[PDB]
Amino acid sequence: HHHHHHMETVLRGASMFDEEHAFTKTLRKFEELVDEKYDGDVTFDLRLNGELGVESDYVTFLNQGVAIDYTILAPSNMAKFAPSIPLMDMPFLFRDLDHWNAVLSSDVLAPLEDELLEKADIKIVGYTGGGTRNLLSKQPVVTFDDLKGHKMRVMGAPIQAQIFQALTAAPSAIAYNEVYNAIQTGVIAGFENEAASIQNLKFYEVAPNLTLTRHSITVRPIVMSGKTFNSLPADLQAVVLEAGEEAGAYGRELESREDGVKLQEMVDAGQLTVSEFENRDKMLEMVKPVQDAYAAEIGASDLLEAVR
Ligand SMILES: O=C(O)[C@H]1O[C@H](O)[C@@H](O)[C@@H](O)[C@H]1O
Numbered sequence: 001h002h003h004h005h006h007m008e009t010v011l012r013g014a015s016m017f018d019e020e021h022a023f024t025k026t027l028r029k030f031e032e033l034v035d036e037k038y039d040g041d042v043t044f045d046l047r048l049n050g051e052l053g054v055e056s057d058y059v060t061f062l063n064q065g066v067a068i069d070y071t072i073l074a075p076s077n078m079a080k081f082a083p084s085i086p087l088m089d090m091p092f093l094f095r096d097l098d099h100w101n102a103v104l105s106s107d108v109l110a111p112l113e114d115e116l117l118e119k120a121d122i123k124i125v126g127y128t129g130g131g132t133r134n135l136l137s138k139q140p141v142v143t144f145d146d147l148k149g150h151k152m153r154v155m156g157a158p159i160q161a162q163i164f165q166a167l168t169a170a171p172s173a174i175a176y177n178e179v180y181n182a183i184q185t186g187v188i189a190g191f192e193n194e195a196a197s198i199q200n201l202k203f204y205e206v207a208p209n210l211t212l213t214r215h216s217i218t219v220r221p222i223v224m225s226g227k228t229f230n231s232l233p234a235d236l237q238a239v240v241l242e243a244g245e246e247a248g249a250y251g252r253e254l255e256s257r258e259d260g261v262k263l264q265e266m267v268d269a270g271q272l273t274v275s276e277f278e279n280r281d282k283m284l285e286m287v288k289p290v291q292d293a294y295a296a297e298i299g300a301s302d303l304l305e306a307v308r
Pocket residue numbers: 055072073074077155176192193194197218220
C-alpha cells in the first residue's frame with residue numbers, strides 16, 4: 001500500500017484499447033524508457049481495455065490530479081478544459097503526412113501546450129498519433145447528396161460539429177463508448193475514426209462502409225496530470241519529458257505506417273468496403289470559413305496561418 005511521498009513511486013495509466021493498439025504500445029514504450037533512463041525506482045500500472053473509462057473520463061481525472069497519472073488524449077476530447085487545444089489537429093488542418101510531420105518536428109504548438117498546462121493543469125510530455133480519420137457508416141456515404149443530413153457522431157469540441165455542419169451533415173456529440181450501439185440501433189448512421197481504432201474496437205461490425213474523406217491526421221499528446229508531474233523530483237521530471245518525446249516518436253511512426261496496412265487487412269477480411277468521396281477536394285473550400293472563425297475566436301489566427 002505504502003508509496004513514496006512527493007517502496008516505490010507508482011504511476012497509473014489508462015488506455016481504451018488492448019495490447020495490440022498503437023496507443024497502448026506507446027504507453028508501454030513510455031514506461032520502458034522511463035525505466036531505462038531513470039537512475040531510480042518507479043512502478044507503472046497501466047489499466048487497459050477501457051477499464052477506467054474513455055478519454056472524456058480521463059481528461060477530468062487528470063485535471064483533478066487523482067485516479068490516473070498519465071494517458072493519451074485527443075485534442076477534441078479536451079475542449080471543456082482547454083478551448084484552444086482542438087486547433088492542434090482540427091479537421092482539414094494538414095495537407096498530408098509530410099505537413100503533419102513538419103509540425104510535430106517543430107515547437108510551433110508550444111502556445112497550445114502552455115494553455116493546456118495553465119488552464120487545465122495537464123502537462124504534454126510527448127506526441128503520438130498519425131492515424132488518418134475517415135467517415136465510417138452503415139450505408140455508403142460517397143457524394144454530397146449522401147452527406148446532406150447524414151447523422152454522425154463527433155467528439156465534443158465545438159470545431160468538430162462546426163466542420164461537419166459546414167459539410168451539410170447532422171453531427172451529434174455522443175460518447176465514444178455509445179457509438180457502436182447508437183449505430184447498431186440506427187440513432188446515427190456513422191461516425192469518423194482512424195484505421196487502428198476501428199479495427200481494435202471492431203466498429204466495422206456495425207459500420208462496414210468507409211469513405212476516404214481523410215479529414216484528419218491525428219495529433220495525440222501523451223499527457224500527465226500537472227499535479228503529478230510537478231510533484232515528481234526534478235530529475236524524474238526531465239526523464240519523463242525525454243521518455244515522452246521518444247515514445248511519441250515511436251508511436252506516430254508506428255501508427256502512420258500501419259494505417260493503410262490495417263485498412264487493407266479489413267478489406268481482405270471482408271470487414272470493410274472502402275470508397276472514395278466524389279469531389280472530396282470541394283470540402284477544403286467549404287471548411288475554410290469555419291476554421292478561420294474558430295482560430296479568430298481563440299486569438300490563434302497567427303498560429304493557424306503559420307501551420308498552413
Ligand atoms: O473518436 C474518439 O473519441 C477517439 O477515436 C480514437 O479512438 C482515438 O483517436 C481517440 O484518441 C479519440 O479521438
